[PDB]
């Protein structure tokens, strides 16, 4: 996260760390959506051009964290993966369309002050909140700068959803209805973006109607980080919710 701020304790209790076992490193962010299911971006687990194809046994999920590198004894919980499910129509060839994946955990994770699931939007949540100018929240342990460092604790930044033509006009990549983009325009002066290591983490919004946090987006892609005239792109969770339900209902 670039031009973000240190998160508060328990501010993002659905935040998940995807952690590679060996060599031990941060893989991506992710989200807790119930006691045995984690939501992330497909490209975190499968990206053939770079020969990325992680199996269940290649990683762990870490829940309840605040500190990036510390093992947070008595706070964080670490779970093993039972099975990974990638959207079968995820388009890794062209544009990361349908950049979404689920992971089922071996055992249910116990909720705590630090561990708690986020809600998923329904049609009206989406219709009500996913409007240009409405701000959402992105969190992660990724890079603080496009090039140079890394944070000691979880970072947070709030960013406004952007008009679809402006999103369109900022990139040569073909944009689909299953993506949205968020961020400040050069005129606004305020800054912020996701960056390397933030992938797969949540874009959330707090409904003013019921005071709950909903995950509207998944950090998907962009070009560099916090560049002027560029915007972060996010997977449209509500648009892929039929698949999410399908998988959870089936498995």
């Amino acid at each position: 996260i670039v031009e973000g701020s240190d998160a508060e304790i328990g501010m993002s209790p659905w935040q998940v760390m995807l952690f590679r076992k060996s060599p031990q490193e941060l893989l991506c962010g992710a989200s807790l959506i119930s006691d045995r299911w984690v939501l992330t971006a497909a490209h975190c687990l499968l990206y053939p051009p770079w020969d990325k194809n992680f199996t269940e046994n290649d990683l762990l999920v870490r829940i309840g964290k605040h500190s990036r590198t510390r093992y947070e004894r008595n706070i964080e919980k670490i779970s093993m993966l039972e099975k990974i499910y990638i959207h079968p129509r995820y388009n890794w060839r062209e544009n990361l369309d349908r950049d979404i994946a689920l992971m089922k955990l071996k055992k249910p994770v116990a909720f705590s002050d630090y561990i708690h699931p986020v809600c998923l939007p329904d049609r009206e949540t989406a219709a009500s909140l996913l409007q240009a100018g409405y701000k959402g929240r992105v969190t992660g342990w990724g890079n603080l700068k496009e090039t140079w460092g890394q944070p000691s604790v979880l970072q947070v930044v709030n960013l406004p959803i952007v008009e679809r033509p402006v999103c369109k006009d900022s990139t040569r990549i073909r944009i689909t209805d299953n993506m949205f983009c968020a961020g400040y325009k050069p005129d606004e002066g305020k800054r912020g973006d996701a960056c390397e290591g933030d992938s797969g983490g949540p874009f959330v919004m707090k409904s003013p109607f019921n005071n709950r946090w909903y995950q509207m987006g998944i950090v998907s892609w962009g070009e560099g980080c916090d560049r002027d005239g560029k915007y972060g792109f996010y997977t449209h969770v509500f648009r892929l919710k039929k698949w999410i339900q399908k998988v959870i209902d089936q498995f």
Partner: peptide, 10 residues
């Protein structure tokens, strides 16, 4: 720089 995790988890 990642602190070692309890062996069990791995």
């Amino acid at each position: 720089d990642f602190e070692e995790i309890p062996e069990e988890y791995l």
